Amino acid sequence: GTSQWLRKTVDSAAVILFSKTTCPYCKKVKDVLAEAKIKHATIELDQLSNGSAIQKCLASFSKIETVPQMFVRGKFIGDSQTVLKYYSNDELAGIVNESKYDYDLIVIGGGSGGLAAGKEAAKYGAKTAVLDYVEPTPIGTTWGLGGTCVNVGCIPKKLMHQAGLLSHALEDAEHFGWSLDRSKISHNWSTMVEGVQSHIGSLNWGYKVALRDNQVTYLNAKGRLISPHEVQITDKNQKVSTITGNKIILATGERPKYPEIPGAVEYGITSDDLFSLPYFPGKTLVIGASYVALECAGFLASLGGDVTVMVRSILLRGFDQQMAEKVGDYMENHGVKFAKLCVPDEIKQLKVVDTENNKPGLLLVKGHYTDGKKFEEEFETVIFAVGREPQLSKVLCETVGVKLDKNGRVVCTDDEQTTVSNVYAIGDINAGKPQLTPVAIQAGRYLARRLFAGATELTDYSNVATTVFTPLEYGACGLSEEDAIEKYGDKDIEVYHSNFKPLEWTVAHREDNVCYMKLVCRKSDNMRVLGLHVLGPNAGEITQGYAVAIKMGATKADFDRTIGIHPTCSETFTTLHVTKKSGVSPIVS
Amino acid sequence: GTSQWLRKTVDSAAVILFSKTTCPYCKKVKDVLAEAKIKHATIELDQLSNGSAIQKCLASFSKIETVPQMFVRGKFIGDSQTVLKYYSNDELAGIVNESKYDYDLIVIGGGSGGLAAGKEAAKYGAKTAVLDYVEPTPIGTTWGLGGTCVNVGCIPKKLMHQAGLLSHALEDAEHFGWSLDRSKISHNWSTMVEGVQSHIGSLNWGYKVALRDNQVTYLNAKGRLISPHEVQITDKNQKVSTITGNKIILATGERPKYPEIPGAVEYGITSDDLFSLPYFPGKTLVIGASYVALECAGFLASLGGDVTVMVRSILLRGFDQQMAEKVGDYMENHGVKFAKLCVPDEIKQLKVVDTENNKPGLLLVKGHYTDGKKFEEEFETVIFAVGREPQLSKVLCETVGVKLDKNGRVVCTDDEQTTVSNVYAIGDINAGKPQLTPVAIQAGRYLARRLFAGATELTDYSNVATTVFTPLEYGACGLSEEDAIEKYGDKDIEVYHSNFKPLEWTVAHREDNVCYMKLVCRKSDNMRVLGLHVLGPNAGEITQGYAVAIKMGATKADFDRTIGIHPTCSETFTTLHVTKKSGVSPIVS
Ligand SMILES: Cc1cc2nc3c(=O)[nH]c(=O)nc-3n(C[C@H](O)[C@H](O)[C@H](O)COP(=O)(O)OP(=O)(O)OC[C@H]3O[C@@H](n4cnc5c(N)ncnc54)[C@H](O)[C@@H]3O)c2cc1C
Ligand SMILES: Cc1cc2nc3c(=O)[nH]c(=O)nc-3n(C[C@H](O)[C@H](O)[C@H](O)COP(=O)(O)OP(=O)(O)OC[C@H]3O[C@@H](n4cnc5c(N)ncnc54)[C@H](O)[C@@H]3O)c2cc1C
Ligand SMILES: COc1nc2ccccc2nc1CCC(=O)O
Ligand SMILES: COc1nc2ccccc2nc1CCC(=O)O
Ligand SMILES: [K+]
Ligand SMILES: [K+]
Incomplete structure (x- = not known):
């Protein structure tokens, strides 16, 4: 085990120092590296039960068993005398920057997983590039760096949930002695969206600053993996170039699905559009029964909306069905209407959105129930929440040799490794894993530490x-x-x-x-x-x-x-x- | 161990059946007891690793090793044939009700611990009496069954905290898009108190119903333990009688302390008076720095009160002092004033409470700081939160032989046993234990199961x-x-x-x-x-x-x-x- 671990650690680390906590020669190298602003991993062999075995294995790479030993991209560089020689000769900068590749790490996707992975990798001296691009929705919605959760997921959904909870807080406040005339209280959708978007804007900016402060290269560019080490990038100007990387992390996430019915793409919206919608949705139909569908229906009803959820079969498929029933029962008893055992057939436009006065349009939704009855009702807004899917080209992935499953997700080992050994996948595109932000972040940070700091800990998905x-x-x-x-x-x-x-x-x-x-x-x-x-x-x-x-x-x-x-x-x-x-x-x- | 356990179990159980899950004769006795409305403990020997050893030990009491075996108050009563003989002869009611004592259990105190203990004991056929009496505060405040937490503690404090949190919810609601004129919103203290007191009233009633439904005798009477098995009771009419019990549980709790300064008892109030105060406190001084002092100051400030806390030394003595500082800093930054390193010397009355229009009086508080500066300021209400103390007569306890510590709390074994072996103490009077409602409830229910159902589990206070x-x-x-x-x-x-x-x-x-x-x-x-x-x-x-x-x-x-x-x-x-x-x-x- 020790030999296999050491070989993988030395091969993959960008810059790594084998050290002991009580080793003045080790401290002198640490001081030089810190003076030269050279970031690196450090492994203290006296804090490892197999440290003595590791020291002996190191001689297979360096021909010595003493500390300190410094390695760059799989090559032994020197002991303390050699590192100080490079420093004193102004050679050390050129040595720690020498690579076959532009970057130690290229992260394709600047969301929950990719930003976590990129920032963590950069801490150990991995020269890192994070690529992020937001393909516009069909109505043209786009947003800034930080991915689904930050821009069109957990963050704005939970803020709009909080606005909904505050409805109930206004009701409760009267019973607890507060004197307020609720008949004169209303909600303003656009004031709430402006608040939410100002917070999202602070995160978009925060991430750009955080990448700058970790010496990560942020490219606002679409990445395509064209061979194991080569990423083609297309900038906003449609200019195409190629950059090369040692390790690649695919962290490209998913986007909403649409049903294949007339009018869905043209007249409906998804959660991608809802969180920055410039007009109040008004009378709303949510098609779907996922946690997104129910979360969105729920806050819109608590903000005074006339809301219906159109449910094909059951609520929250894959969750505990007793609990899903209770969740839906609470909603139905507190202002949400449910069209059960019902599917849509067509969306027709009755009115165009007012892009000058920020009012919704009007839509006719035609569908049918399992009992054969027709559904035909007008809504101001129609939100599809019928699933999310990865966006990887199945053809290109096959050409490079990255295996996908029948759903288009990446098939990984328990250490996030794809079938291309320098290429890893994290977050929502990793087949079989829980699709959650804290999962993507733990996966990204733990992978970065294994690649670049000799860590062994795997992410526990159980x-x-x-x-x-x-x-x-x-x-x-x-x-x-x-x-x-x-x-x-x-x-x-x-x-x-x-x-x-x-x-x-x-x-x-x-x-x-x-x-x-x-x-x-x-x-x-x-x-x-x-x-x-x-x-x-x-x-x-x-x-x-x-x-x-x-x-x-x-x-x-x-x-x-x-x-x-x-x-x-x-x-x-x-x-x-x-x-x-x-x-x-x-x-x- | 098995022999010692069995002897204690048989001695203390009111009504207990030794059984096996697969034992038709055991089922016949269970059916007779259930028909006769005879509550009892049951121990299934085939669900215990030492069950076979227990069967053999049972012969030391009954002369048999078969199941079923029924015991009443330490006496073997019979196998299945004998129990059905008593039933068929209308003798079984008289046998299961025969005792040297009026009650198997007398609980002195109807609060968190005592109601938990009494209800749980009654489930195993222990004939139980719960005594509760609320000595009025100096201004005459009293309340109903359920103890400190229910009436003047956790329940009303957390409800008034919620009214305070809803202040911040009104502020937050504007930022989340709600349109409300906060300049026209005020709080009504008495409307909130009426709400809180209606909920407390529902608990007072609930407990009386729960005791009736468990065949527990509820006496609204002051109890005094005058010998190991004899409790003197004094009813509201000052009528004195004596009842006898096998096991006694002391669960009498504590009451607020007052400082020994002129005017404190006459013009101040405590948490006992605050939770039903018929008038808004108005400009308030809280003397003390306990969690009660800070909790009370905190909600009064969030309800629009002018609030000062007078702190002798530190906040939350015995809690983590970094965290206590942060708690107090938040309060000081959000509207609570602190008079630090300050003690009161005297309270003078400036105005009497208006008991007809529900307005506070007015008080002059004189005190001094450690720097020698005088404190002299007017407040409408002065709340002492300077500690709580048990109310047991030190003399009478010594006469019966129940050991108290120098603070007047009861010195107990890790199984709540006092120095009088049939007498137990639970809750806030149990020396050295955390003074919390869920502690008193777990202690009471676990003790009841050891006394009357042969349980061994102790309460973990760590x-x-x-x-x-x-x-x-x-x-x-x-x-x-x-x-x-x-x-x-x-x-x-x-x-x-x-x-x-x-x-x-x-x-x-x-x-x-x-x-x-x-x-x-x-x-x-x-x-x-x-x-x-x-x-x-x-x-x-x-x-x-x-x-x-x-x-x-x-x-x-x-x-x-x-x-x-x-x-x-x-x-x-x-x-x-x-x-x-x-x-x-x-x-x-
Ligand atoms: C409405 C909703 C609510 C949610 N709520 C919660 C919640 O409360 N809690 C929770 O834990 N999870 C929640 N989730 C899930 C959570 O958002 C995701 O699990 C998480 O964002 C996945 O992170 P990721 O890094 O895999 O991908 P993403 O965050 O989707 O980031 C991928 C990024 O890569 C970009 N990209 C795609 N292709 C390319 C390319 N070729 N080149 C460059 N960039 C590209 C994408 O545009 C995007 O910016 C929610 C999801 C949604 C939709
Ligand atoms: C302001 C305040 C807030 C608190 N907040 C919390 C909190 O949020 N969470 C928490 O866990 N704990 C809290 N506590 C602590 C909690 O209230 C107590 O730990 C709990 O009530 C103790 O229960 P007990 O059974 O020992 O006694 P008590 O609940 O005090 O009950 C004892 C009862 O016996 C009666 N009695 C006294 N002498 C006799 C007698 N001779 N005969 C008959 N009856 C008698 C008493 O009048 C009383 O009704 C709070 C306490 C206070 C004062
Ligand atoms: C996981 O998605 C589904 N799986 C199914 C499996 C078996 C039967 C039906 C199913 N329907 C859906 C998705 C839409 C729905 O919940 O009806
Ligand atoms: C536990 O009560 C106290 N213990 C102390 C111990 C040592 C020194 C002072 C102390 N003061 C109090 C109670 C009031 C206060 O917090 O000043
Ligand atoms: K974690
Ligand atoms: K418990």
Whole structure:
């Protein structure tokens, strides 16, 4: 293992120093490198149990077993005397910059994964380029650096969710003694969008500054991988050039799908357009039943919108269906209409968007229900939320030899390596991985450390917690109840559950027995918690800490022995006792 | 162990059935007991690794080793034939009700611990009485069943905190696009108190119904333990009688202290009076620096109050002092005034409370600073928050033989047993234990199960998480940084930390680099997390789940391997990297 590790580490590191913490010669090299502004990885052999074995293996590359040893791009450069020789002769700059390639790393895609990977790689002296380009939506929407989450995903969706939550805060404030005339209070969509877009603008700028401050080259250019080490770039002026890189990270993400019906591309919008929409959507139809569809429907209804969701089959396919039903029931009871078992056939235009006075157009949506009844209703805005897909050319990928699956996603090893050994894929294009921002960031930063700092830690994609930011939020970590029963059998599954009522909801006259949580446990494995599920306010804050306990193998007894914090929603997890097998109601007084 | 356990279990259980899950004779006894409405504990010997040993030990009490075996108050009553004989002869009711004592359990105190203990004991057929009496405050305030938390603690404090948070929600709503004229919005104290008191009233009633539905006797009476098994009760009419009990649970809690200065008792109030105060406090002085003092000052300031806190030395003594400073700094920057290194000398009355128009009086407070300067300022309300103390007669406790410490709290074994072996103490009077509602409830329910259902599980009082519901909340679990350094030495402690900014605060134009979290870790124990600390919104929701991971022995690597939920405040715990030893700033972009 030690020999294989050392060979890979030496081959891939841009600039790396083998050192010991107590080694004055090591300190002298560190001081020279720091004076010369040369960034590098450092491995302290006296902080590794196999450090003595590593020292002996180093002689296979350098012919010495002493520290310090400095390497550049797979070549031993010297001990302390040799490094100080290069410095004193003004040779050291030329040596640490010598490469077959323009860059140690080229990241194609400046989103959650690619910016994380690029910034982290640059810290170890990898000469890094990040390419980002935002192909416009069909109506011409575009945005700045930072990817889906920053511009058209997690950040603006959660801000618009917060504007929706503040609706309920205005209602609650009267019950808690605040004197306000709600009959005279309205929401202004464009004022909210201006706020959200000013924050996004601060992130676009922040990322450009962060790349500049890490000596990363940012190119606003479309990248195409044309051979293992060569990236063709096309700038805004349609000027084409080629740059070369040692390691390549594909981090190009996905874009919204459209249904293949007349009028969809011409008259509908997607989440890409919604978060900067210059006009209030008005009476809205959301087609789809993903977390995006329900999140978007939810905040638009809480901002005073007339909202309908058109659902082909079920809500939140792949999530726990009991929890998905409760999420949708809350929405239907709080102002969202559902056209269930219904699909669209055509969108017709009745009015064009007013691009001068910022008002929506008008659309006729024709569809049909499974019962044979026609759907025909006017909406001001139609939002498709029917899935996202990667944008890689299947032909070009095959030419370079990067394997894709039938969905067009990249087939990777558990260390993000593609079938082209210097090329890696992270984030939403990595086939089979949870499509989440913190996953892409951990994958990118951990990969950068393996490539350029001799790290071994892999990303753990198991039991990744999530939250759906519907009007009543849904947090989960681990298996759905149905998936646990399919895997282990009904006889080996115990489910503990309870309704609960936030204290905040009492004086506000909100519902009893609507917030709900459950633990899905394995009887034969000491009642191991396989799945945790919570429907309630602040569900992401609730869920996150339990994700650490589940990663560690938490059992029901671990939950029971922990004392609650009172008064909280989360403390209910520490006192669950009603099982589903008992048939006793989970409702509470 | 098995023999000692069985003897204690048989001696203390009111009604207990030794059974096996697959035992038709056992089912017949269960069916008779259920028909006769006889509640009991059940131990299924085939669900215990030492069940076969227990069966053999049972013959020391019953002369048989078969199941079922039924016991009442330490006496073997019969196998299946004998129990059906008693039933068929109408003798079984008289047998299961025969005792030397009126009650199996008398709980003195109907608060967090005592109601938890009493309800749980009654489930196993313990004939239970709960005594509760609320001695009026000096101004005559009293309230109903449920104890400090329900009436004058956690429940109303967190509701008034929520009313305060909704102030900030009104401010935030304008930035998120809501059109409201804040210059015309005011708070009505009495409307909020009416809401809070209607919820408390629903809990007072709920508890009385819950005790009735568990066949618990509720006496609104002051109890005094006059011998190990005899409780003298004094009813509202000053009528005195004696009831007897097998087990006694002392669960009498604490009441606020007053400083020994002129005017304090006559003109000041405490948290006991604040939560039902019929008039707005108006310009308020809070004397003290406990979590109660700061929680109360905090919500009164957010409800438009002119509030000053008079601090003798430090804030939140016994909490992490870095975190206490940040808590107080946030308050001082958001409308709370602090009179630091100051003590009161006298309260003089300037105006009497208007009990007809619900307005406060007026008070002159005279005190002094450590620098020798006089304090002399008028306030409408003066709230003392200078500590709480138990109310047990030191003389009577000595007469029965219940040992108290120098603070008047009860000295208990790790199973809540006092120096009088049938008498137990739970909750705030249990010397050395965290004074928290969920602690009292877990202690009471776990004790009831040991007394009456043969349970062995003890309450774990280690690493109990807390939250201070100041305007910016502070959640913690485990050691303060200073206490970790005192225990293990500075060289063995590593502290990871970061500022952070809630996404909710961006568009709302709230502060960068004010919310803050840290992990206090032990270097020599695999970077074991000794203490977790977070200052930010929803800090109780954030902290609770990590308390399970800390109970399980979480390390920094456990935190790092877990993936964040985005966008949340809690996810910052999964990506901490800045150490205090590095000297690198914890501020973030
Ligand atoms: C509406 C919505 C809400 C979401 N909410 C959440 C949430 O709350 N929490 C969460 O964790 N996740 C959420 N997600 C998922 C999250 O946005 C993604 O998992 C994350 O953005 C994926 O990051 P990535 O680096 O794979 O790609 P992206 O962030 O999509 O970045 C890829 C970038 O590469 C660019 N690019 C594409 N092709 C090229 C090319 N040839 N050359 C150069 N650049 C190119 C793209 O235009 C883009 O800028 C949400 C997604 C959406 C759509
Ligand atoms: C302002 C404030 C805020 C708090 N906030 C929180 C918080 O947010 N979270 C938290 O976990 N904890 C909080 N606490 C602590 C919590 O209230 C206590 O830890 C908890 O109430 C203790 O329960 P207990 O059963 O020991 O006693 P108590 O709840 O005090 O109940 C004891 C009862 O016995 C009665 N009694 C006394 N003597 C006799 C007698 N001789 N005969 C009969 N009855 C008698 C008392 O009047 C009372 O009704 C707070 C406390 C205060 C004061
Ligand atoms: C994963 O996407 C789907 N998978 C399915 C599998 C089996 C049957 C139907 C399915 N429908 C969808 C996507 C749209 C929908 O939820 O109806
Ligand atoms: C625990 O209560 C205190 N302990 C102290 C110990 C040593 C020195 C002073 C102390 N003061 C208080 C209570 C009031 C205060 O915080 O000043
Ligand atoms: K518990
Ligand atoms: K992490």
